[PDB]
Each structure stands twice: as C-alpha cells, then as structure tokens.
Amino acid sequence: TEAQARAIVNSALKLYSQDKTGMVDFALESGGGSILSTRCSETYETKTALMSLFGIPLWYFSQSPRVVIQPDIYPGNCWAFKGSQGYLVVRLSMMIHPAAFTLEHIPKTLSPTGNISSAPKDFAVYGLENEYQEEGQLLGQFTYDQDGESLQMFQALKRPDDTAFQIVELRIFSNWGHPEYTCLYRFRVHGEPV
Amino acid sequence: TEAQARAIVNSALKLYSQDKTGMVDFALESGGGSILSTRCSETYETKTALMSLFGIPLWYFSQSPRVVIQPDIYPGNCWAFKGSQGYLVVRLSMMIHPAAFTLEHIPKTLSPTGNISSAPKDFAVYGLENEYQEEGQLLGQFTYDQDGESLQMFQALKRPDDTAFQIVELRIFSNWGHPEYTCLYRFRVHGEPV
Amino acid sequence: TEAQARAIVNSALKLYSQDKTGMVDFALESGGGSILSTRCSETYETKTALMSLFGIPLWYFSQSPRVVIQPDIYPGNCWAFKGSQGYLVVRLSMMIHPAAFTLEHIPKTLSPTGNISSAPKDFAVYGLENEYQEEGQLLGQFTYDQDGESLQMFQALKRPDDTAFQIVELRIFSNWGHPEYTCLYRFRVHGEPV
Amino acid sequence: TEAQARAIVNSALKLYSQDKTGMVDFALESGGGSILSTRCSETYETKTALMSLFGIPLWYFSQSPRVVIQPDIYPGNCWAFKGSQGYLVVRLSMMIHPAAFTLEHIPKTLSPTGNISSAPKDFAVYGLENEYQEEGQLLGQFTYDQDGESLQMFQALKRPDDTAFQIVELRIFSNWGHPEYTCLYRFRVHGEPV
Amino acid sequence: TEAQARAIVNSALKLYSQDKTGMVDFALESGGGSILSTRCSETYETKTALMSLFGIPLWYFSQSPRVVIQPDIYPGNCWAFKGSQGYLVVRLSMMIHPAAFTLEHIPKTLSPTGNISSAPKDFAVYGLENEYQEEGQLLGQFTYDQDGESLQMFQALKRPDDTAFQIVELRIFSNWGHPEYTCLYRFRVHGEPV
Amino acid sequence: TEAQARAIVNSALKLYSQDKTGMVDFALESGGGSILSTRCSETYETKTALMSLFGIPLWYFSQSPRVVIQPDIYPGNCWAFKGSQGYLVVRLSMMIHPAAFTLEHIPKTLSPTGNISSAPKDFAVYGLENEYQEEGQLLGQFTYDQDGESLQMFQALKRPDDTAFQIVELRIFSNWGHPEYTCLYRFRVHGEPV
Amino acid sequence: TEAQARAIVNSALKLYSQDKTGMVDFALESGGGSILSTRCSETYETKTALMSLFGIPLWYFSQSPRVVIQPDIYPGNCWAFKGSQGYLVVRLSMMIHPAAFTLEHIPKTLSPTGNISSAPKDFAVYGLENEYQEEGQLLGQFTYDQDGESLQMFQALKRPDDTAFQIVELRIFSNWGHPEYTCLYRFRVHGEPV
Amino acid sequence: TEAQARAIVNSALKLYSQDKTGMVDFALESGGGSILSTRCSETYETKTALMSLFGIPLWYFSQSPRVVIQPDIYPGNCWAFKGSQGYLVVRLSMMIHPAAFTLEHIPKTLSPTGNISSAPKDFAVYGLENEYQEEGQLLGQFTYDQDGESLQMFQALKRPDDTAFQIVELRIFSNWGHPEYTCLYRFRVHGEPV
Amino acid sequence: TEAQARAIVNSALKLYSQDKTGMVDFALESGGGSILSTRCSETYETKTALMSLFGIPLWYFSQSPRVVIQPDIYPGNCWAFKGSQGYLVVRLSMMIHPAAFTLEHIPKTLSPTGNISSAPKDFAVYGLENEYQEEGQLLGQFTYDQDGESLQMFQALKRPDDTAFQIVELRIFSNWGHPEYTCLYRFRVHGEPV
Amino acid sequence: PFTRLRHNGPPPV
Amino acid sequence: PFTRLRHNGPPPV
Amino acid sequence: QEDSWTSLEHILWPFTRLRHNGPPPV
Amino acid sequence: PFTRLRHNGPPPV
Amino acid sequence: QEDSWTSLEHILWPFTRLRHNGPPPV
Amino acid sequence: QEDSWTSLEHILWPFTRLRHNGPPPV
Ligand SMILES: [Cl-]
Ligand SMILES: [Cl-]
Ligand SMILES: [Cl-]
Ligand SMILES: [K+]
Ligand SMILES: [K+]
Ligand SMILES: [K+]
Ligand SMILES: [K+]
Ligand SMILES: [K+]
Ligand SMILES: [K+]
Ligand SMILES: [K+]
Ligand SMILES: [K+]
Ligand SMILES: [K+]
C-alpha cells in the first residue's frame, strides 16, 4: 500500500495546486473577470487603517470589491460592504452556461476576532443579460454554513434550457451576525463556455 | 486503511492551508497587526526590489519591516536590517495572552548561496503595556536554528498573573554569520484574546 | 504503518512548500534574478489600450515579461509574446553551472478557453557570457508536453567543461497551436553556484 | 567661361539654399503658419507603426497634418488622409494677397513602393475670410503632375481686385490612384503682405 | 543717566535681534539642523484632507515636524502630534556637548481658543549616538510652565564626562490638557561644539 | 530707577513680540482665517514682475489677497487691488463678537516711491451671516490716517446686542491718491469667541 | 523721567520695526529690486536647503543670490558664492543718488562654529549706467568688520556731479578666511530718488 | 555651352536633392525600415544629447541605433556602440534583391579632433530570411575608407538564385582606432523590389 | 572642359554638403557644444503664453537659445532676445585657439515681414577662461551686413600669444532696427584644437 | 481628479 | 485627458 | 478612476507605513 | 487645468 | 490637446523603439 | 485651484529668477 499512499498524496496535492478545485473560475480577475463597481453595494467606510508617508497621514485604506475575485484569502483580504445584506456584480471572462459557484471565507481558527460573524449567510446568484437588468434569472439560493469548510461549493439550478450568461449578480441576503459589515473573501463562477 | 489514508492526507492539507499552523497570527498585517516603524532598527539599504508601472521599470527600493508581518516568504521577501542585531515592534490586532511565536526563514535548499547565514539566530520577545514603554516584560529567550525546519515555533514563558499585551517587541541579538545584514522573513504572535 | 503514511504525507507537503521542487531558482526575481527587457521579444499587443492621454490610446499590453520570474501562476499571470517564436533573456542571481530548467503552464482544467494551445512547445536554453552576445552556448533542446504535468523539468546538457553562466536565453520555437501569441507562466533555472 | 561657370553654380546653390525657391512661404509653421485641425479631412488610421518602450507596446504612430507645413520631405514625412480626396485648412503667418502655391511630393525614384500613386492629383486653393466659411473664394484649380518635377509651383488666378487672406483651404479632389490614402509632403503659400 | 537708559534699551534690542537668546541654536533647520522624520511620532491626523485624487481624499495633516526647527511662531505654525505623548528626533548642525534647551509656545493672549492646553507640559531630552538607538542618554527632565513666558530655557544635566551628541530626542510625556493633540512651536538645542 | 527702566523695556519688547498688540487675530491665516477669493475685488494686473527659469520667461508674479492675512509687511508684501476702492471678504478662524480691527501699512520712510498714496483711506467693516450676504451689518466706518502710525487700531461700534460673526467684509471706499491701485498690507480682526 | 524713558523705549522699538534703519532699501526685492543673475559670480554648490511638498521631502538645493535682497537673516539664509572673491549686480527699484550701503551678517554668537570666517571682508560698490556697462563709477571701498555689529553701514563717496544710478555692482575681494565660499546675508542700497 | 553648363548644374543639384543618390533606401525608417533593437550590439553610454521641454533642460541621453536609419548626419548624430565590433539588424520596407549598401560618416574636415578614428572600418552585410535566423547569406565584405569620401557605396555580391531579403544584418568588425566606441552615422540598403 | 565644369560643380556641392563651410563648428550642439543658459541674456517674452495651469498662463517664449547652435535656419528657428543688446555664452566641444566665427541670418527674400531688421548688426566675440569671468578677452569686433550673404564669416584677431578657450561669449551691441527684439539664427566657432 | 478640498475646520494652534 | 479604458476583451491566458 | 487609483496605490504601497487604529474588517 | 493656449500672433523671425 | 500630445511625443521619441508591421504611408 | 497654484509657486519660487521691469505695487 506504499505506492498507493504516494498516489493518494500526489493526487490530493495536485488537486490542491489547481486552485483547490480543478475547475475554471470564470469570475477570476487575472483570467479576465471584472467587477461592475457601480452595481455593487456601498463599501464599508472605516478610517482605521491609516497609510502615512514620512510620518504624514496620507489616506485611509479600505479593500475594493475587486479583491473578491482575487485568490488571496488571508484574514482581511476581503471586501467589506456596509451592513448585513448587499450585492456584487461580476462580469465573467467568457459567456458560459453557469453550473456551480464557490464561496470561500477564512476559517474561525484563523479569525483574530474569534468568530466569523461577518461571513455571508443567505445568498442567491442571478444571471444578467446586460449590465442594466435589475433582477435577472435566478441561478440558485444557498446558505454559506459558518460551521462548514472554508471553501464551499454550490450547484446551479437545473433548467429545461441552458441560458448562457457573462454577467452574474451575487445577492447576499444576510450575514452571520456582524453588526456593521459583511466580508466577502472570494467568489467563483464555474460552468461551460458556449 | 485506504479511507484512513485519505483522512490523514486531507487533515494535513487542511492544516497546511490554514497558514500552515491552524492558529491565529495576531501580528499579521492584513488581520490588523501593525509595525511601529519608529521603533524598528535600521533597514539595510539594498535597493534590490524593482518597482514598475505599466511594464516600465522606474527604480529599485529596499523592503520595509512591514514584510515581516506579510505571508509571502519566497527568497528576498524579507526585511533586511543592518548588522547582526536589531529590533522590531509590532502592535497586535487584539489584546491577548501570548502563548507562542513563530519565525520563518527560507530553507537552505532554496537559498542561492547554499547557506542561510543572514537568518536570525538568538532573539528574545517582550510584552509592552503601551507603545512608549521602554522596559517590557520578557516573554522568552530563543534561538532560530539554522539546521531546523523553515517554520519554527517558540513557546512563551507563562507567568501566574494574567497580564495581556497588545504590543510585542522582537529583539534579535545575533545572526548566522552574515557580516552585513540580517533577514527576517515572517514573525507571528499566537495566544488567547482577553 | 500509520506513522509511515504520516511520513509520506509530510515529506510531500514539505517538498510542495519548497517552491514545489526543493531547488534554488536562480532566475527568481525576488531572489535576485532579473529580466533584461531590452533583449527580449516584443510583448504581445492587445487589441485595446489601457488608457488614453490627450486623445491618444496608450499601453496595448497585458503583462510584462517580469511575470515569467514571479511564482504566481493563476490564469493570465503570464507573459504573452507575439506569434509562436520568441525569446526571453534572464540575468541570474549568481554565476552558476546550470543543471536543469523548469517551465510551468496552467493545466488545461483551469484554462477558460478549454485548451492550452498558447503554451510553449519546442524550446531551447542558451548560456550567454553577456547579454549582447549574438550566438550563445546551447544548454539544451526540449519540448513542453501539453499532455504532461503543469510543472515540467528539463535536464541541462551534460558538459565536459565547467563554464558558468549568469545570463541565460530561453528561445521558444513553437507553441501548441494558438494563432496569435504564446504565453509563458514561469521559467526557472537550477544549478550549482561557482 | 570659368568664372561664368562658378557664377552659375553659386547662383544655383544660393537659390537652392533659399528653400529651393527664394520666396516667402506664408504657410510655413516655424514662421507662424498653423493648421486648423478641426477643418482637415480625417487622418488615415493605421496600426502598423508601433512605438514601444522597454518592449512594451505603447502607441501607434501616424503623422499629423502639421507635417504639411514642415520642410522635411524624406519618404513618409507626409500627412496621409483617408481616401482619395480631402482637404486641409492653413492659417497663414500674415494677411497676404496670395500670388502662387507650391506642392512638393517625393520623386518616384525614392519611393519604396515603386510609384507615387498616393500623390495629390487634382486640387484647388480657396481663400477663407474666417475659419467658419465653407467654400471661400477660388484662388485656382490645378493638377500636380506625377510625371513632372518633385516641386511644382502654381500661379493664383488674376482678379480685377486683390482680396487679401490669412486662411487658405487646399482641396484635393483626387490622387494618383492609391486605394487607401493620399499623402501630402509639403504645401506652400506665396504672395504679398498687406 | 539718559545715556544709561539708551544703553539698557539698545542691549535689550540687540539680544532680542539675536534670536531672542544670543545663543547658537544647533537644531535650527536653516543653520544645518534637520528632523529625522522617520523616527518621529506620527503627525496628528486632521478631520478633513487637503485634496482628493481619483476620488480619494489625500493629506490629512496641518504642519510637518520641520516647523519645530523653524523660527516663525505665529499661531498654527507648530507641529501637532496625536494625543499627549510623543517624540521628535533632531540631527544637530554639529557634534556638541549640549548645555541647554529652549521650548517656545504661543502666549495665551494670542491663542484663539483662549487657552494653551495643547502646549507640552512634562518632557525630557535624550542624546543619541545614532538615530536607531533604542535607549538614549538622559540630558534632562523638565516641565514647560503654561503660566510662564512664551520662551522657556532649561539647563542640561551637569555631567562628569563629556560625550558629545549630534542627535537629540525630545520626548513629551504630557500636555496642558488638550484631549486630541499636542502642539510644538519651536525647540532649540544650545551647547559647545567639540 | 534702573530696575524700573529694565521693567519698562522688557514690557515693551514683550508686547512687541506678541504680534505688536497682545491680541488674538481671528483673521490670521496660519491660525485658521481664510480669504473668500470669489468675493474680493479684482487684483491689479501687472506684467512687470517676470519670473523666469533658465532664462525662459515663465509667469508674471502678482500677490494674492491671502497676503493680507499674513504678518510680513516689508514693502510690496501687500495685495494690490485694481483702482481706488474695493473690498475683501475674510472668513475668521472662530465665531466671535468682533470688538476691534487693525490695519497696517508700510511707513512712508520705507516706501521706495517716496509716498504711501496706495494706502487705504476711508473704509468700513461689515459682519456677514453667510458668504452670500451682500451688505451685512455695519461694524464700523473709519479712516486709515496716512500721517499716523504704521499700525492703526479701530474700535467696533457698540450695539445693544452682541451679534457674533465668522465672516467679515472689509470695504475700502478710497485710497490716498494712487491712480492705479490700492495696496493692503495686513488686516486683523479682534474680539471675543462665543 | 518715567515718561521720557517710555519715549526712548518706544522710539527705539519704532526704529527697530522699520527694517532696523528707518531708511528705504532700494535693493530690496519685494520693493522692486532685482538680481541680475547673469551678472553674479558662481554659486557655491551646497545643497543644504530642503524642499518639501505636503510634508514629503523632495530634494536639497543651494540658495540663489536673490536671498541677498530678502530680509530673513537667520543662519544659513545667505547666498554662498564660490571662493573668497565674487560679485553681484542689483537693479534698484528707483533711479537714486546713492548715499549709503548696508551689509548684514549673522553675529558670532549665533554661528555654530563660533566664528564667521565666511563673512565678506573687503568690498567695493560701483554705479552702473546700464546693465551692459563694464566699467562703472566707484561709489566706495569698504571692509565688513568681523569684530563689529551684525548690521554695518557704509557711506557712499559723494561726487559733485549729480549722476543717478539704478544699477549697483557689489564686488567682494576677500572674506574672513573660509577656504571654500563666502556667505552674503543681506545687502541694502540707500539714497535719494531723483 | 552656357545652356549645357546650366544643364550640368541642374542635373547635379537634382541628384543631390534626391537623398544624394537618387536611389530608394529600403532601410530608411520614415519610409518603413525598422531597427530590430534586440538584435543590435551594446550602445556606448555617452549621455551627450540634451533633452529639454519648454526650454528647460531635463537630462542627457545617448543616441539609439534608430539614428543609423535617419538622414541627419551632423557631427554627433550617430549611434555609438561599445568597442570596435558590433552589429545591427534592420528590417527593410520591402522584400528586395539587394544591389548595394551605402555607409556615411562625417568628413574629417568637420570632426573636432581632426580625425575620424571612431568611424567603422571593416564590415560585412548578411541577408536574413526571418528575424530569428542565426546564419544569414553573405551579401558582401567591405571596408569604409577613412581617406575616402563621406558617403561611400558598396556593391552587393549577386548570386544566380533570386533570393530576396527583407532583413539585413550589418556586422562591423573593426573601426579606425577609437579605443572606446564606434560611431555609425547612416547605413542605407538599395535594390530592386520583387 | 565639360569635365572641368563637372569638377567645379562637384567641388561646390561637396563644400555645400560640408555644413556650407568645410570647417569644424566647435559650438555645434550635436558635436558637443552647449549653451550656458544661466549666463545668457533673457529670452524675449512673447505677448501670449504657451499654456495655462491652474488658471495661470505659463511659458511666454518662442525658442530657447539652444537653437543658435543648431543648423536648421528656416524662418523662426532663431533665438530672440529682448531689445537690441544681448549676449550668448557657449561652451565649445574642445579647447581651441579660435580662428574665425560664422553668423547666419535668413535672407530678406524669405522674411515674411519683408525685412531683416531683427538681424544682429554690431557684435564682438570674447574668449572666457570660465563662464563666471566678468571681463573676457576680445577675439574680435564685427558687423553683420544686412545687405550681404545669409552666411557671413569673421576673422578672429591675430594674436601674438596662443591662449586657448573653451568658452566664448557673443555680445550683440545693435540690430538692424527691429524695435522689440533681436533674432540669432546660427553662430559658429572655428579654430584649431590644442 | 486633482481636486483641492477646503477644510472649514481650524488647524491645530 | 488621463482617461482609463476598459478592454472588454479577455487577456492572454 | 478606480483603475487610476489602484495603480497609484500599487506605486505607493511599499513606501507607506500602515497603522491600524482599530481592527480592520476580517 | 493643463490648458494649451493658441498664440494667434506670429513668432519672432 | 494636440499641442500637449506633440510635446509629449517629442519627449518620448528618442527613447521608444519603432517597429513597422507593414509599410507606413509614403 | 488657487491652492494648487500657490503650492506650485512654493515649489518654483527658489529656482526661478525675478526681474522687475517696472516698480511692483507697494
Ligand atoms: Cl484605499
Ligand atoms: Cl502619433
Ligand atoms: Cl503670481
Ligand atoms: K480575496
Ligand atoms: K514576508
Ligand atoms: K508568473
Ligand atoms: K513635410
Ligand atoms: K515654528
Ligand atoms: K502681508
Ligand atoms: K537674506
Ligand atoms: K543619422
Ligand atoms: K538655428
């Protein structure tokens, strides 16, 4: 069973090295995904991360919604939107039949605050035919489980047809209790190109 | 034992993915840690990092002590301070009882010279009650072993009183022989919030 | 043998954490390698520009060749050159006897387009005594296998003599079919310093 | 006849040194002439002259109509307007009674293409009383002869009165056959100041 | 005694014209002193910024610490640091044995707010052998008296030895009650050059 | 009487050092006063103070109305407005009951022209409730006496109530004869904060 | 004699406040004097004045001869010219009969070295009829006395004819021993306008 | 013979005006020639050309190999390459059968030193079938004669096959004695388009 | 004698191509000469500026003095100084014994205004041992003849001694009548290097 | 957008 | 005019 | 505008100091 | 406001 | 705007490389 | 706008030369 153990380990490390899932992320910014910033919720305003230069206060740092489609997920490498429900609109790198979505959040064991009450909880994903459409087509309703794994994957609804989209709206309907903001670490969109 | 093998493999990968330790790093900058840069020793002037804009090279610069609380540890992603003695002060993201510290350095197999003579060797960690306090509380005396693993963990002295700290000072007294500078790749602080 | 399984897993993870190879990359930018950009092929011209200034569109490119000696290899973090033939000139962090080379490309499973036709195919590596040398010394001829692993290593020609090099040229003679450009995600140089 | 030969040669070289004609060019930019750019035909759009910086594609070079009132006439130092008929509006350095016009084009013997099909052929020159006048006063109708000399001069129509102008419109009604564009190397305006 | 009165008046005016003290200020910027701004406390962050760039407010400060070694002391020409504890590090124009120090603050009669609660109160001066020295040599402990004169002078500790200093640190331990910041109008260093 | 002489001299020098008056100037720019530039008279246009760089004429220097609330009063450190009557609007650093005003002009003995015909003569001061109010409340009508002292102080009218202001308009109704402009060196506003 | 004492005191303060002399300075720049910078000797390259913007240090520079006709005379606010011989030409704000000249230097008690070896010593002043005149009219030969007062006044030679001047040349022949440069703090020209 | 004299004179001036040769230069940049700058030898770092903007000098720079295919040949308008050996590759404006090459250098009478020791001496020209071809076809071996005329023409070897070229490599093997660099003023390629 | 005619013509054209003179111009900028712009007269201030920035018009000039040592002499490619007297200081490319000077001006036949009243008339050339030397050595006094040729040459004074110069000053004492400015098209310095 | 802001709040004194 | 353009076309991958 | 700001932020990032005065969102 | 002005007046010649 | 661009082009010209990918207009 | 110009004027002031061609207002 030694060679079999090596095979299991190598297979797990291979999957791990492929963005943990082995699946194309069509939202990923470096691959061509982008945030439609005017269709995102308001970013949480905080004057507590002060950037200075030669001791001179220069500007207050806050993360933009772009970080949601970037792979780094160390604590704090997340977009914080104001309040406990909000939305994010993503233009995908290709026109696809969306098949599944991934949400990542830091595990509690790494959270400096002791909890992940700022994680998203109830959410839904919609396909938009253009950047001006309000609601779009429901692709699925889900819950990110604060007691589950850091990375959670969700299957899109099966429809009699396969309508393709290049714009998806993530609607976060609730968070896990944080009284000021909700933090999104990474959102991925998987599916089949046209 | 195949299911057990997969369990061992998955458990190791999960721990690996959790910042290798599975423990909150209260010094990590993105999580709320901060360098008190006026309370660091002198940066060695290396001018070995290139800055570019739109693909155009602009100028070379030296890494600041902020990289000590940032997770990237490829060769060169370290703060180089002048000589073989130095100090660094970090404000933590929470008031904690410190339990342990982690120092990382690149392994010898990744160092171009074959050695890590610039790695820190003897060091001590102090708890500070405020950022103007000159004499802090000794939390431990340690040696980073150049013949050990890249990531090394160090247990804090525990004292019967429950004094919590939100400021830590790292004092490096010696390095592994480099005559010009010492390179710190990453320093982490672990413990329990109050 | 549970301890043997844990040993297999820990060894594989240790090697994985050591830049996947456990070998110095003398080309790595943060470790002291650099692109000699005035000696490299011209970067692929994208269809649209990044900005406009005084009515003129400026910057028709995606990534500069520096990314070839940076470790992030998420899709799109690659240098694209025009067509299917090109060259990249790298100054190493030390004078070495080159022993092996590594080329990485994204796996097909992460490619948005479904293919990796833009991956390099036939290539050779030459050692140069200086960056203006017209004809270099052949260190080896190779093919990146699109059906192989993402990371591939190539053994330098066994040489009777020991001339060291601090400059290498990577020459790409063909790609895996993309009609517009070729994408290089990461190139590494391994060997023994003098 | 030796002194007479020297006199002939010196006289020819003198005339040559005086901008080839010995006549004031009131359109000449350095002397105060200028192009009214919003009243010129569309410039021919070509993405074939790529300017790059450190290998990075930067912008696509095309000549502006200003070069028509600049003396350099090496091949390519010409304004190319889209198609085979167009117009150029020039503000003169002084208010004048226009007496003659000069057009220069490269000789065929220097054309890399073997022909000068892009030279202007049928043209007319109009005096404009202000920059908003559509047609203006016809000052003459002419043909640039592709089989004649590089520099050709044309006499303005004699009018019972002498109306002065400081704006002239050059209308090119046809070229010598080039299917994409027409190239103007230099246009001069001669006459008497008021 | 009219001549004696004129003599008294001229002596007082002469001393007044000699920077009020008749003593070299080795900290004075125009004479060669300088602020080591990377070793000073952070400048107080004002509520609003000086400009905005690309929608981001920039520069939340009023004066830089350089004004502490400039002679103008009209209200507002002072360096404000956050809170009631801070420090300022000054390189002197020469290596000296420090003999005395001067602190100036505006008088209450010129303060718009009616008070000088932002004036420093308890402070100490240390000589440093270099700007990265953690613990300096105490040159003296003093209190600026809010009920005293605008300009106050303080005698350095009488010392058995003669170690000269070219760097001094001014440490402010308290102010006269302002809850947000402390304002330093001018600090001078007097003594004998080596 | 020697100690009494020293007391008189020291008292005079003290008052002199306190901005000559010992009174808060709520208009003073460094203390928070500011000019409302769109409510000031037109600045006198002169092309006679040429700034050049490397011999190249660069711009024509003229003083702005800000200099009126700056303490320097060497000849020429004044705002010149066009003609012989005009106005200046000042926002004060605090809301106050205005009690008195100060005007300074250079003494004739220092004027390069031999006279101070450009000094203000008849003027009035008004309190404005907001920056859009045309006339406001008359606070007093005065004359700056060209035969009096350089610094002249004027008492505000006594009113049955004390209305506070943070904006005052200085209306200059005449000058001392200069045919082109009127020069204001410094205007101060004194009073009691609310 | 108390009223007389106050009179003496007030008279001295009034004279002090009038640029210390009570006399027009026709060289003063803000009053209309100008340096003819092409007719000055070489500036010593000191690079000892710091330039900053928004609190950010940008670069060091040397003072220009313009500071000689500007009133600030704190240590370092001087033009340093190369060597111990130099010249400076100033155009006056009026055509005058020159009566006297003033040179100021810092007193020894304010000089960091204890001496003023860089002060000018022997000098002469010439009247020039136009700015291209090479041979001017000697207005006096003088010595600035390093053992005298900071401000020293020098009487012009008066000649029976009434030749007025609007251009003055200051020639410095020697300094008080500094081997590298000579420092001029302020030069003034007094007289009667025509 | 007077008419014949004028004919001779006019014929010589006409030929002179046609780029001195009356022949297409397929290397000329404005006509479509291009330097392949990654296939040129090292530029000598001279920093002897001044760049200015708005009359303000900004910095010094060295000429690039592009000046070799630009027509201005005043002293200094040349590419200086390091040492006495170098190479330059030019892509031609058309695919041609090369018939001849022209090299120009300044005449000795215009060189400040009296000699042209930096002029190229022995050189060879090769035809390249594509820009990656290492071994090209010898088109001729030549010597630029320092005792000859400024413009020298060189006849290509003609081979029976009709191989056309659009890329030419100029190899310089030696210069006329300058120990530091070699200066190329202009290189031209003549022939017949296919 | 047809061959003799061709010889006369070729000699005249050869001399013409050698910068019209066949003599080194040690002032020529591209050959190593330079304008010492801080020692030159101020450039003529045009009526309007080239741009505006933040509401202020900037750059009131036409050409910088560099154009005097550049060979293009189309109308307007000249340096204009104010009035009819001025000076230009040039550093030569080598230390030489000056033998002759050349001044060029446009011919009347190319002048838009009909005249060349702005051409220099009386002038002199001085050799300077350094650029701050007040009085130079007269190398000669001359008049540019407005009725002569465009290019005029002037013989340096015959000198008993051989002091070389690398800096020359051109002093213009008068022009040919223009009431506003004087225009210099090109100035050359010829001689023998040491 | 190099816009300049007006503080409207008095500086430290 | 320091305007920033949006590509709308995917980068090389 | 945001593209402009993020590229400027890239240039600024290494050279600035960052002080947290309270916990950032995590 | 980096605006570019048009002279409308001829340069020195 | 064109004046601004041409002055920037002047600054850029010597330092850029120029590749023709097809014949420019002549 | 005036704040921008005055800060630029601050940067420029020491490095420029100033010629009065007639008396400034005093
Ligand atoms: Cl931010
Ligand atoms: Cl262009
Ligand atoms: Cl101004
Ligand atoms: K992220
Ligand atoms: K790090
Ligand atoms: K990469
Ligand atoms: K042209
Ligand atoms: K101060
Ligand atoms: K003032
Ligand atoms: K001064
Ligand atoms: K050339
Ligand atoms: K010229």
Author numbering:
A (entry chain A), B (entry chain C), C (entry chain B), D (entry chain A), E (entry chain B), F (entry chain A), ...: 618 to 811
J (entry chain E), K (entry chain E), M (entry chain E): 543 to 555
L (entry chain D), N (entry chain D), O (entry chain D): 530 to 555
Show passages lifted from the paper:
The Linker of Nucleoskeleton and Cytoskeleton (LINC) complex crosses both inner and outer nuclear membranes of the nuclear envelope to mechanically transduce cytoskeletal forces to nuclear contents. It is formed of nuclear SUN (Sad1 and UNC84 homology) and cytoplasmic KASH (Klarsicht, ANC-1, and Syne homology) proteins, which interact within the nuclear lumen.
Thus, we crystallised the SUN1-KASH6 complex and solved its X-ray crystal structures from several crystals at resolutions between 1.7 and 2.3 Å. In contrast with previous SUN-KASH 6:6 structures, the SUN1-KASH6 crystal structure contains nine SUN domains, such that head-to-head interfaces of three SUN1 trimers interact together around a three-fold symmetry axis in a ‘trimer-of-trimers’ configuration. KASH6 peptides are clearly bound at both of these KASH-binding pockets of each SUN1 trimer (these are herein referred to as KASH6α and KASH6β). The third KASH-binding pocket of each SUN1 trimer is located on the underside of the trimer-of-trimers structure, away from inter-trimer interfaces. At the remaining KASH6γ/unbound site, KASH-lidγ adopts a low angled conformation in which its β-structure follows the path that would normally be occupied by the KASH peptide. This localisation likely acts as a steric hindrance for KASH-binding. As the only remaining binding interface is the minimal binding pocket for the KASH peptide C-terminus, this likely substantially reduces the binding affinity, accounting for the lack of stable binding by a third KASH6 peptide. Hence, treatment at pH 5.0 triggers the conformational change of SUN1-KASH6 from a symmetric head-to-head 6:6 structure into an asymmetric trimer-of-trimers 9:6 assembly. This conformational change requires the dissociation of two KASH6 molecules from each 6:6 complex. Hence, the few amino-acids of a KASH6γ peptide observed in the 1.7 Å crystal structure were likely remnants of the peptide having failed to fully dissociate upon trimer-of-trimers assembly.
